[PDB]
Amino acid sequence: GNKICQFKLVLLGESPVGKSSLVLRFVKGQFHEFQESTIGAAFLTQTVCLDDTTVKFEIWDTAGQERYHSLAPMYYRGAQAAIVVYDITNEESFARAKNWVKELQRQASPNIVIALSGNKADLANKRAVDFQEAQSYADDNSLLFMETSAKTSMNVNEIFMAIAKKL
Numbered sequence: 001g002n003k004i005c006q007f008k009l010v011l012l013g014e015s016p017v018g019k020s021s022l023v024l025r026f027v028k029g030q031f032h033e034f035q036e037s038t039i040g041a042a043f044l045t046q047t048v049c050l051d052d053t054t055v056k057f058e059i060w061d062t063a064g065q066e067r068y069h070s071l072a073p074m075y076y077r078g079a080q081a082a083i084v085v086y087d088i089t090n091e092e093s094f095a096r097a098k099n100w101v102k103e104l105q106r107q108a109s110p111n112i113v114i115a116l117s118g119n120k121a122d123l124a125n126k127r128a129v130d131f132q133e134a135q136s137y138a139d140d141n142s143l144l145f146m147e148t149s150a151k152t153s154m155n156v157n158e159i160f161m162a163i164a165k166k167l
């Protein structure tokens, strides 16, 4: 197809849960066991083929530390979609993700598409958040949920493409 679409996506979530790794896997097909903590935010782009459309993603990878919380609106205000990330081995990060979802529902665009990534799914032997519980939470809050692994690539391209399909 010759159609072209571009949308703004922001990633939010506690640090560290693998936010930068998720983006790096999607954008560069890389995974770094040793990642420097993000300072403020990082910007990345990726262009893909979705049926008959060429879709370009403008992605804001936010630093998740609480001291950066006040800067989050700079990145989500104009966002068409968000991926709120948690780590499936860390229940506290899952609770933090629900608070990010609440903030987006109240302060971001009313039509923003919100995805929820239960990351580090390759560490299921250390699971702290039940898949079905997360799925139910996502269903009840109209969120696009998938467990992902930046380390193995599991569902990484899939969650980004699913968001694009719904925009």
Ligand SMILES: Nc1nc2c(ncn2[C@@H]2O[C@H](COP(=O)(O)OP(=O)(O)O)[C@@H](O)[C@H]2O)c(=O)[nH]1
Pocket: 014, 015, 016, 017, 018, 019, 020, 021, 022, 032, 033, 034, 035, 036, 037, 038, 064, 119, 120, 121, 122, 123, 148, 149, 150, 151, 152
């Ligand atoms: N096992 C595993 N480690 C991961 C995964 N995603 C990220 N990590 C690791 O967890 C750490 C934090 O990741 P990073 O992307 O910097 O987290 P951020 O602080 O949320 O941006 C790094 O040591 C990564 O290699 C994943 O899916 N599986």
Ligand SMILES: [Mg+2]
Pocket: 019, 020, 021, 037, 038, 061, 062, 063, 064
């Ligand atoms: Mg980061």
